[PDB]
Design a protein around this ligand. Structure first.
Ligand SMILES: *[C@@H]1O[C@H](CO)[C@@H](O[C@@H]2O[C@H](CO)[C@@H](O[C@@H]3O[C@H](CO)[C@@H](O)[C@H](O)[C@@H]3O)[C@H](O)[C@H]2NC(C)=O)[C@H](O)[C@H]1NC(C)=O
Ligand SMILES: *[C@@H]1O[C@H](CO)[C@@H](O[C@@H]2O[C@H](CO)[C@@H](O[C@@H]3O[C@H](CO)[C@@H](O)[C@H](O)[C@@H]3O)[C@H](O)[C@H]2NC(C)=O)[C@H](O)[C@H]1NC(C)=O
Ligand code: NAG
Ligand code: NAG
Ligand code: CA
Ligand code: CA
Ligand code: CA
Ligand code: CA
Ligand code: CA
Ligand code: CA
Ligand code: CA
Ligand code: CA
Ligand code: CA
Ligand code: CA
Ligand code: CA
Ligand code: CA
Ligand code: CA
Ligand code: CA
Ligand code: CA
Ligand code: CA
Ligand code: CA
Ligand code: CA
Ligand code: CA
Ligand code: CA
Lengths: 439, 439
């Protein structure tokens, strides 16, 4: 009817207590038989002495106390029946109770010998991150008592050990104490150590890995800020113009880049295609220099981050000239010489070095492809003389003057064909006529 | 019945000849009427004098002599009838003939005031190239007599004027006297001048253009002889590896280049694609560094000439490592400790710092992705000690030794789980077990 406090895991045949403190007398005509708790306990039979056995009483692994709360003790009950050896025929039944005293026979440890914590790279100082707890099958001071953060020099002054001391359970926590930057270090090796509070203390150690996640904190940047390239007029579709490239220090989709035309006039969009993945600018239209000599635009690199960061680069492509236009001869009336549908009305009186018509010839190409030379065909008395001076210009003009004295009778009409050709390869030629009619 | 030689284009009423040399007498009872050649000739009627008219006799443009050969003269016949004025009733019929003497009234000229000759750029010295002839409506010395080649300084000492003097006709010819090279000059401006042989002489001048055709005499050349590039393991299909570029000084199809793998092992062909037109090498397979750390090959640029000229360029791509392989834990028997299906048979006698098994852990990645750390899980009396020294190698090995004194009774069997993790981002972990059974 009284309780007996006993340590667990005692050695066999350890005296727990004597019922001498109870009502019976020592070895006095009473048989002490045990009826309950047979596996663990054992009685002297003659005396009221209780003893242990070779089946060690284990607080941690005994049914009676498995799902228990911290405050409650581990109890196992027993029933010792005493029968008077004087043949009196009425056994007494003494109910008894054992409170198992705990002892530090279990080590605290973590579910896994390694722990992986994931911390965004620009988390503000003071941020907390929980660590998986260590469990101790023991109770009281023999349970989890204190953690400790063992880290290297670099890791020190970045991470600290703060512990929520909530009566529920020890909550360990990693406090961020410095700025992280995945583009500098993306892995840290901490070591966490746990101990229990009974002496001598038990301990465990798990490796705490801290990897840092990527934030889109870096925008893309182009190899060089601006791009130059040349491209031949009338190039074949698919011909490669230039390749633009930018790279981003981030990781994953925060560094995956896509290229797109930024503020490109329609005229350029029609003629150029920009492969968004490879950043390759190729031709997709008729590159005609005479329409546009040089095309300018800016390309945009955008990383695939949720809040994507941009980057701009200027690019200019100069179009190299091709000889795809022939010279053009125009004939018009100089001074008082009216022209109409390619005809002229002249008298045979003013006949020497007299300008009849003014011819201007011009070629839309560049340089040697517009270096035009012009002459008069056949045998007709009309010289082409240098009209005026534009320097060394590609377009020139000539006085179409007379070289002979004319007479209405012998010569009646004319048909003059002027021929022009450019110094190209292949060369291009044009011809234009003029029927000077005399009166 | 006699012939009369007369120049053409005479002035009207020019005395050609008198029939006084014939049988009749001057103005003696004979009427001289003209019956043939009315348009051009005219007779005095009283005398036997023949005269011209205002319809000028033209050798060049008269029907009687159009399709004639050089030797033949221009003839026109006439019939003068004489009737005796003494009423004798039997007219005599005098047949006569005029040979038109030629005079230099026509200028030699070319069909076109400009002539375009096409000369391959590496034609050997001495090669001949015909020039269109000049035509002269005149005949004899009044016809084409001599050409002349008027050229600039640069053109001089490259081209000469040689003339086939075949009795058929003057054949002008341009003789090549120096090496041409379209990659140096692709256009030349000669001037050809023709004259006739009657004095004063007539002349014409046509511009003779000489353009040079392209021969595939230049092979392509790469921007730089060799190419380096980096490429991340397991890159997405289509990702741009590098762009190779070569250019050729020729023109047209002799400079159009196509790029193809030259002597590339199949392993590289499976993983890389080379766009033959743009020369862009992109990814088309699983880039696995552990299979090949760096891929080397050579690319070929071939111009589209009929006899195409080649160009080779070496290229090496180093594969950047990714953490796509987890560490591997192997457990094997050290010394006299036989292992079988992950078991061991040990006695509790040798118990302190006694190697039970040998563990070797290794990661196929590189650097931090193979920087492995290894530990023992849970609470079990077995320490991992540094087995031996490979320096700072990525693969390590540990003695799996005992840390406590064992006894067959209290401890009966074990299950040890070794855990390994690499210093990657993300990190990869592996685990391997070993059931050491005691006897
Ligand atoms: C994004 O692109 C830029 C520009 O290409 C990269 O920066 C460049 O990286 C190369 C490779 O290391 C550097 O080459 C270095 O050159 C110096 C001499 O200039 C030499 O001493 C080194 O041994 C090395 O060969 C280059 O200097 C550097 N340029 C700049 C302006 O930074 C950048 O690395 C790329 N991004 C990533 C994530 O790789
Ligand atoms: C085929 O590609 C080669 C290599 O890119 C071209 O040769 C290069 O042409 C550029 C453009 O003129 C040259 O730039 C020059 O640089 C010098 C200083 O190095 C500067 O003083 C000049 O004003 C000019 O900017 C470059 O030097 C030259 N490199 C070599 C090795 O020749 C070549 O032109 C291309 N083929 C064709 C037909 O264009
Ligand atoms: C020349 O005069 C005729 C006569 O009326 C006229 O029809 C023609 O248009 C004139 N041409 C020029 C160029 O003056
Ligand atoms: C241990 O001994 C048992 C007994 O036969 C045997 O079956 C087993 O294979 C042995 N294992 C080792 C690792 O020696
Ligand atoms: Ca216990
Ligand atoms: Ca404990
Ligand atoms: Ca305990
Ligand atoms: Ca950062
Ligand atoms: Ca980042
Ligand atoms: Ca980014
Ligand atoms: Ca054009
Ligand atoms: Ca052009
Ligand atoms: Ca032109
Ligand atoms: Ca007149
Ligand atoms: Ca004539
Ligand atoms: Ca002539
Ligand atoms: Ca003549
Ligand atoms: Ca050449
Ligand atoms: Ca060539
Ligand atoms: Ca070529
Ligand atoms: Ca791989
Ligand atoms: Ca790898
Ligand atoms: Ca790895
Ligand atoms: Ca023993």
């Amino acid at each position: 009817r009284v309780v007996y406090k006993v340590p667990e895991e005692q050695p066999p045949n350890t005296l727990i207590g004597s019922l001498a403190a109870d009502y019976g007398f020592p070895d006095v005509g009473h048989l002490y038989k045990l009826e309950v708790g047979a596996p663990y306990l054992r009685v002297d039979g003659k005396t009221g002495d209780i003893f242990t056995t070779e089946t060690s009483i284990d607080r941690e692994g005994l049914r009676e106390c498995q799902n228990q709360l911290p405050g409650d003790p581990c109890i196992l009950e027993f029933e010792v029946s005493i029968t008077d050896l004087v043949q009196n025929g009425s056994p007494r039944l003494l109910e008894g109770q054992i409170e198992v005293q705990d002892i530090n026979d279990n080590t605290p440890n973590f579910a896994s010998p390694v722990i992986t914590l994931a911390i965004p790279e620009n988390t503000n100082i003071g941020s907390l991150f929980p660590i998986p707890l260590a469990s101790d099958r023991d109770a009281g001071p023999n349970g989890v008592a204190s953690y400790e953060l063992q880290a290297g020099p670099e890791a020190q002054e970045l991470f600290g050990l703060q512990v929520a001391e909530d009566q529920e359970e020890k909550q360990p926590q990693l406090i961020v104490m410095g700025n992280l930057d995945r583009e500098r270090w993306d892995s840290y090796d901490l070591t966490i150590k746990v101990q229990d509070g009974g002496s001598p203390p038990r301990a465990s150690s798990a490796l705490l890995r801290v990897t840092v996640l990527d934030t889109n904190d870096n925008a893309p940047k182009f190899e060089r800020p601006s791009y130059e390239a040349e491209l031949s007029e009338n190039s074949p579709i698919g011909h490669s113009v230039i390749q633009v490239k930018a790279n981003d220090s981030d990781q994953g989709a925060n560094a995956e880049i896509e290229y797109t035309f930024h503020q490109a006039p329609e005229v350029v969009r029609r003629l150029l295609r920009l492969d968004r993945n490879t950043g390759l600018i190729t031709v997709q239209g008729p590159v005609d220099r005479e329409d546009l000599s040089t095309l300018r635009f800016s390309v945009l690199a955008k990383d695939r981050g949720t809040n994507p960061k941009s980057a701009r680069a200027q690019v200019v492509v100069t179009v190299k000239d091709m000889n795809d236009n022939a010279p053009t001869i125009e004939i018009r009336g100089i001074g008082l010489v009216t022209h109409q549908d390619g005809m002229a009305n002249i008298s045979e009186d003013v006949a020497e070095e007299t300008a009849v018509a003014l011819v201007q010839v011009s070629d839309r190409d560049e340089g040697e492809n517009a270096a035009v030379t012009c002459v008069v065909a056949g045998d007709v008395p009309f010289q082409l003389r240098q009209a005026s001076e534009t320097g060394s210009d590609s377009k020139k003009k000539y006085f179409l003057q007379t070289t002979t004295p004319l007479d209405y009778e012998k010569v009646k009409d004319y048909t003059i064909e002027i021929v022009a050709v450019d110094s190209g390869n292949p060369p291009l030629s044009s011809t234009n006529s003029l029927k000077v009619q005399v009166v």
